[PDB]
Design a protein around this ligand. Structure first.
Ligand SMILES: CCCCCC(=O)N[C@H]1CCOC1=O
Ligand SMILES: CCCCCC(=O)N[C@H]1CCOC1=O
Lengths: 178, 178
């Protein structure tokens, strides 16, 4: 269990409380999307996606079970699927449950030609910067990622901490929905 | 989704946040009992029990699926089972999800001879006063009750509100455990 954030204002504390309270009442994909729309409305980004995956023994996604696009450009997602970027996207290689991953930091460390190709393409599509939160359940090797694209979220330490803490509850909701 | 309480102090708000955060990480009966022990340590009672039940079409328990005794006297539970009090206990007739039920108020309204007998017996065993919180999921007609015995909890409006809000999350945890 990841620790709750220190240094939140009463307003931020209340927002987080509302978010985790709401998340625990999510039963349907409809409710899940509606809730993510609400969370999105509080972040300095316009691009959010949640995915659920079956994991390997190192807590990496080996199979995508559900992709819930909230506000990624549909053209980018279409390209991602069509061009099989799942095989080249460094974000899908994260060890889930090991802490928030900043994309620019992860991208700068990539070495493969195909990975660099993907990064260049993501960059042209306004996806060069962002953050991915994650949670995993070894009850049945299942995990979730919450991705938010942009530079501003990562610079808001409180928001990062809030979304990070929300993530395990979104994970439980996603499992219920699936 | 029941509304979060108004008028909590920052400390009470933080406690509630910790409780719902912790509840969403519960995966095992062990963890569930340990967490309920923690919650118990914050209430002016020493007697707590959680139960999960399959419901009828009016959201009343028709079958008990799991009874997790945290701190009811074992002698009282033994008697309850042995004497089949489930059939006579007004608390097991609550419509789950319809708000916290104060036992003294519910008991005062009982009319049946067997119900009155049970009430008299509960009273002698220090169970004449208390409160039961509840939540229900019509996904599969399943609900939970959280019972706390004593007079002091009901007199602490903040605690009542906090435990009430925690209940749906304990319910989801109980479903995961079962
Ligand atoms: C469609 C699944 C993609 C989930 C992983 C993710 O958010 N990947 C970022 C990295 C840059 O571009 C993306 O789409
Ligand atoms: C063993 C299941 C009992 C759950 C319902 C409950 O908490 N009933 C109270 C009412 C007075 O005595 C009790 O045990």
């Amino acid at each position: 269990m990841r620790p709750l954030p220190a240094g939140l204002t009463a307003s931020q504390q209340w927002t987080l409380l509302e978010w985790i309270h709401m998340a625990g009442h999510i039963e349907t994909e409809n409710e899940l999307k509606a809730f993510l729309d609400q969370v999105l409305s509080q972040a300095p980004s316009e691009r959010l996606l949640l995915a659920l995956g079956r994991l390997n023994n190192q807590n990496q996604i080996q199979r995508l079970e559900r992709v819930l696009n909230v506000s990624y450009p549909s053209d980018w997602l279409d390209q991602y699927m069509k061009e099989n970027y799942a095989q080249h996207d460094p974000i899908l290689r994260i060890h889930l449950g090991q802490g928030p991953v900043m994309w620019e930091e992860r991208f700068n460390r990539a070495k493969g030609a195909e990975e660099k190709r993907f990064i260049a393409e993501a960059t042209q599509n306004g996806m060069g910067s962002g953050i991915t939160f994650s949670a995993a359940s070894e009850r049945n090797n299942i995990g979730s990622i919450l991705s938010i694209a942009g530079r501003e979220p990562g610079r808001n330490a409180a928001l990062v901490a809030m979304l990070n803490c929300l993530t395990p509850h979104l994970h439980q909701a996603a499992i219920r929905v699936a």
